[PDB]
C-alpha cells in the first residue's frame, strides 16, 4: 500500500517545488500513473484477501473504492483549471494539496484494518473538504454549508468513537480480521440497541439518510466542482463501507433495529426523486438524485444479504462515476453563464452537439438503462428487497418511474428546445472538459464489460 | 407576429376575428368546397344582418351570444395550417435556426472556406457599430412624456440613419434553413 | 385600420436591409473552397471475411465448449432410416380407413 501512498505524498513536493507553469501537468500525469499503480490490487487469484501489514489491507470491497479515489484526482485537477486560472500560484498549489490530501486520507481509510485509523481519517477528510468549500465557493452560503457538513458528521461520529472504545475495552482489539472470527451474539437489550445506534448513525448521516440529508445539497450547491465530485463519489461511499465493515459485530440486532431505517430510506427515495422534478437548481437536482440512490444502498446494507451487498457495491461505484460526470457537465455550462438554474440555458444541443451525447449517456446511466452497472445494482437490490418483503417493489417501481422522469426533464429542458439567442457567450466546448466526460464514461463501459470486479466480498 | 397587439381589443376587431374563426371551423365541418361556399354565404348573411346596428349595449350582447354559439357546435379537431400553432410542422425547423453570433467562434480554418461571406459579415458589423448610438439617441429623444408607451418602433427619420433596433429583425434566421 | 405612415417607412427600411442580408447569404462558385480536392465487392469485404472470423469463433471456441450450441432433436418418422445406427423405425399399423 505504501507503493500507492508514498507517491501520493511526493506529489505534494512535486506540486510546490514545480514552476508555476508546469505544476498542473506534472501532478496530473503522475496522478494518472498512481491510478495505474493502484490496479495491482485487482490481482486476487484466491479467496485470501490481501493483508500487507498490521494496518493496511485491501479486500474486494476496498479495492474498487481505492481505484476510484486514485482515478478521480486527475479529473478533479482538470475540472479545477478553468476556475483558479485567475488565482495566484500559491492558491492553486494549496487547492491541489487539499485534493491530494483527500486522496491520501481516503486511500488510507479504505486500506485500514483497524476502525480507529478508519475513524481518525474519516474525520480528517473534513478539514480539506471544508476548506475547499468555504474558500473557493462563490456564494455566501458557503459558510452555513460548511457548518452543516461539519456538525452533522461530528454529532454522528462522537457516539461512534464511544462505541469503538467500548468494543475495545470489551474485546481487546478493534481489528477487523479478529472481530470477525471472534464474535458473539449480542443479547437483545436497550444498551446494545444504543450501541447499534452509535455505530450506525454516523454513517447513516454520511450516506445520507432521508431525515438527515440537508447538509448534502447545501454543500454540492455551494461547493466548487472538485469538492462536489469527490463528495458525491467517495465521501458518501465512506458511510456504506463503514456500515458493511461494522455490521458483523451487531448481529442479530440488525434484524429488528433496521425497519426504521429501511423504511425511511425506501420512502425518502420517492420523496427525493420527486423533489428532483420541482427543482430549479441543477446541482440540487443531482444531489437529491444522489440521496435517492444512496437510500437503496442503506436499505440493502440493512437487510445484509449477498445479492444486497453486491448490488450496493455496484451502485456505489456507478453512482460515483455518473454523479461526478453530471456535476462536470453542469459546471461546463455554469462557466459560460454563471448561473445554476436549469431554465436559462435550454437549447444547448444546437451549439454543443457532442457535449449533449455526454448528457444523454449520463442521464441514461442515472436512470437504469441496461446493461449499465447502475442498473445491475438497482436490480439485485430490488431482488433482495422483494425476497425481504414482496411489497417493496411498489416503491422501487415508482422510484424508477420518477427517475426516468426527472432525468429526461433535465436533458430536455437543458439541451432540447429553442436556443436562448441572447447567450452570445456560449463558447464551444473545451478539449479538457470533453476529456473529462470521456474519462468518466469509458470506465463505465469497461466495468459493464467486466462486472466481476465491482461485486464485493459476497461474490 | 411582426406587429405587437394593442392595449385592448376593439369591438370591430373582435367581430372580425369571430368571423374568421367561425368560417374556419365551418370549413372544417363543411369539408367539401361547395358546401363550405354555401354555408359561408349563409354566415356572411347572418353577420351582415346586424351590420348597421348602431347601439353598443345590444352589439356586445349579440357578440357574446355569438361567441357562446361558436363555442357550442365547435369542431373539436379543426383544421390548423401545418406551419401554424398546433400544426405538424410548427417548430420542425427551429432546430436548424442557428443564430449568427455562432460564427464569431468559428475557427479560421472553417472561415477560409467562406471568405467573401465573412468580409460581407464584417461590413455588416461595422454598419451596426456605427448606427448604434444614433438610433439609441433617436429613441431616447422621441419618447412621449405622457408616460404611456406603445411597444412599436419608430423609423429612421433622419437620412443616413438606420431604423432603431434592426439587427434582430434583420439577420433573423430563415424559415426553412437546410 | 392599416399601417401607419411611420410603421410603413419602418417596414420599407427593414425590408431593403433584409433583402440585402439574404442576398449576402448567397454563395459564390469558389466557396466552399473545400481543399484539397468493381461490381459488388461489398459482398466479399463485408460478408466473407466476417464469416471467416465468425466461423473461427464458433467452431473453435463456442463448440469445443459444452452446452453452447444445443439443437432440438431432429424429427424421426416411421419409415425413416437413422444414419449412425442404421436403425429402421417400423412403419405404422394399417389404418381401418
Amino acid at each position: 500500500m505504501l507503493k500507492i501512498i508514498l507517491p501520493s505524498l511526493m506529489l505534494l513536493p512535486l506540486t510546490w517545488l514545480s514552476s508555476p507553469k508546469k505544476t498542473w501537468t506534472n501532478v496530473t500525469s503522475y496522478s494518472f500513473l498512481i491510478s495505474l499503480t493502484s490496479l495491482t490490487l485487482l490481482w486476487q487469484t484466491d479467496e485470501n484477501y490481501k493483508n500487507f501489514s498490521n494496518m493496511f489491507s485491501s479486500d474486494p470491497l476496498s479495492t474498487p473504492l481505492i481505484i476510484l479515489t486514485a482515478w478521480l484526482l486527475p479529473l478533479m485537477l482538470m475540472a479545477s483549471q478553468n476556475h483558479l486560472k485567475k488565482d495566484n500560484n500559491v492558491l492553486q498549489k494549496l487547492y491541489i494539496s487539499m485534493l491530494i490530501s483527500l486522496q491520501i486520507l481516503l486511500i488510507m481509510t479504505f486500506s485500514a484494518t483497524e476502525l480507529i485509523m478508519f475513524y481518525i481519517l474519516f474525520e480528517a477528510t473534513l478539514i480539506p473538504t471544508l476548506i475547499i468549500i468555504t474558500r473557493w465557493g462563490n456564494q455566501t452560503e458557503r459558510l452555513n454549508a460548511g457548518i452543516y457538513f461539519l456538525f452533522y458528521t461530528l454529532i454522528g461520529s462522537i457516539p461512534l468513537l464511544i462505541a469503538l472504545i467500548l468494543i475495545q475495552n470489551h474485546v481487546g482489539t478493534l481489528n477487523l480480521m479478529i472481530l470477525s472470527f471472534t464474535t458473539h451474539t449480542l443479547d437483545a437489550s436497550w444498551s446494545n440497541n444504543l450501541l447499534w445506534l452509535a455505530c450506525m448513525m454516523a454513517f447513516l448521516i454520511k450516506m445520507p439518510l432521508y431525515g438527515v440529508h440537508l447538509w448534502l445539497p447545501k454543500a454540492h450547491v455551494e461547493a466548487p466542482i472538485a469538492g462536489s465530485m469527490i463528495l458525491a463519489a467517495i465521501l458518501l461511499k465512506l458511510g456504506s463501507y463503514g456500515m458493511i465493515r461494522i455490521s458483523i459485530i451487531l448481529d442479530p440486532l440488525t434484524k429488528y433495529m433496521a425497519y426504521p431505517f429501511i423504511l425511511l430510506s425506501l420512502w425518502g427515495m420517492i420523496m427525493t426523486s420527486s423533489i428532483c422534478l420541482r427543482q430549479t437548481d441543477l446541482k440540487s437536482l443531482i444531489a437529491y438524485s444522489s440521496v435517492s440512490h444512496m437510500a437503496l444502498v442503506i436499505a440493502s446494507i440493512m437487510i445484509q444479504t449477498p445479492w444486497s451487498f453486491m448490488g450496493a457495491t455496484m451502485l456505489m461505484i456507478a453512482h460515483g462515476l455518473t454523479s461526478s460526470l453530471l456535476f462536470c457537465l453542469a459546471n461546463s455550462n455554469y462557466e459560460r453563464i454563471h448561473s445554476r438554474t436549469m431554465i436559462m440555458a435550454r437549447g444547448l444541443q444546437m451549439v454543443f452537439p457532442l457535449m449533449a451525447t455526454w448528457w444523454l449517456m449520463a442521464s441514461l446511466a442515472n436512470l437504469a438503462l441496461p446493461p449499465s452497472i447502475n442498473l445491475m445494482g438497482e436490480l439485485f437490490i430490488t431482488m433482495s428487497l422483494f425476497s425481504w418483503s414482496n411489497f417493496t417493489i411498489i416503491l422501487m417501481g415508482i422510484n424508477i418511474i420518477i427517475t426516468g422522469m426527472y432525468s429526461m426533464y433535465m436533458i430536455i429542458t437543458t439541451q432540447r428546445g429553442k436556443l436562448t439567442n441572447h447567450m452570445i457567450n456560449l463558447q464551444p466546448s473545451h478539449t479538457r472538459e470533453l476529456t473529462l466526460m470521456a474519462l468518466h464514461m469509458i470506465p463505465l463501459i469497461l466495468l459493464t464489460t467486466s462486472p466481476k470486479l465491482i461485486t464485493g466480498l459476497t461474490m | 407576429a411582426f406587429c405587437a397587439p394593442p392595449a385592448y381589443l376593439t369591438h370591430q376587431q373582435k367581430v372580425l376575428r369571430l368571423y374568421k374563426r367561425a368560417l374556419r371551423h365551418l370549413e372544417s365541418w363543411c369539408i367539401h368546397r361547395d358546401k363550405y361556399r354555401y354555408f359561408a354565404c349563409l354566415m356572411r348573411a347572418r353577420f351582415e344582418e346586424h351590420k348597421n346596428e348602431k347601439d353598443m349595449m345590444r352589439a356586445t350582447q349579440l357578440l357574446r351570444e355569438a361567441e357562446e354559439e361558436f363555442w357550442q357546435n365547435q369542431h373539436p379537431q379543426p383544421y390548423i395550417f401545418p406551419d401554424s400553432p398546433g400544426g405538424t410542422s410548427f417548430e420542425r425547423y427551429e432546430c436548424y435556426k442557428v443564430p449568427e453570433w455562432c460564427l464569431d467562434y468559428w475557427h479560421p480554418s472553417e472561415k477560409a472556406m467562406y471568405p467573401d461571406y465573412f468580409s460581407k459579415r464584417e461590413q455588416w458589423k461595422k454598419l451596426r457599430m456605427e448606427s448604434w448610438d444614433r438610433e439609441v439617441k433617436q429613441l431616447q429623444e422621441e419618447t412621449s412624456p405622457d408616460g404611456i408607451m406603445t411597444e412599436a418602433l419608430p423609423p429612421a427619420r433622419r437620412e443616413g440613419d438606420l431604423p432603431p433596433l434592426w439587427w434582430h429583425i434583420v439577420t433573423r434566421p430563415r424559415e426553412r434553413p437546410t | 385600420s392599416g399601417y401607419t405612415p411611420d410603421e410603413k417607412l419602418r417596414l420599407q427600411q427593414l425590408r431593403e436591409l433584409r433583402r440585402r442580408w439574404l442576398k449576402d447569404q448567397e454563395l459564390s462558385p469558389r466557396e466552399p473552397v473545400l481543399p484539397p480536392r468493381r461490381s459488388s465487392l461489398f459482398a466479399v469485404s463485408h460478408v466473407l471475411i466476417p464469416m471467416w472470423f465468425v466461423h473461427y469463433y464458433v467452431k473453435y471456441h463456442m463448440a469445443t465448449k459444452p452446452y453452447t450450441i444445443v439443437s432440438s432433436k431432429p424429427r424421426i418418422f416411421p419409415g425413416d432410416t437413422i444414419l449412425e445406427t442404421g436403425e429402421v423405425i417400423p412403419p405404422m399399423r394399417d389404418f381401418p380407413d
Binding site: 454543443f352 452537439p353 464551444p428 | 442557428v98 449568427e100 460564427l103 475557427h107 | 447569404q25 454563395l27
Partner: peptide, 12 residues
C-alpha cells in the same frame, strides 16, 4: 442559388 448554412464551430 446556393446559400450559406449557419452552423456552430464543430472544429473543437
Amino acid at each position: 442559388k446556393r446559400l450559406f448554412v449557419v452552423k456552430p464551430s464543430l472544429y473543437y
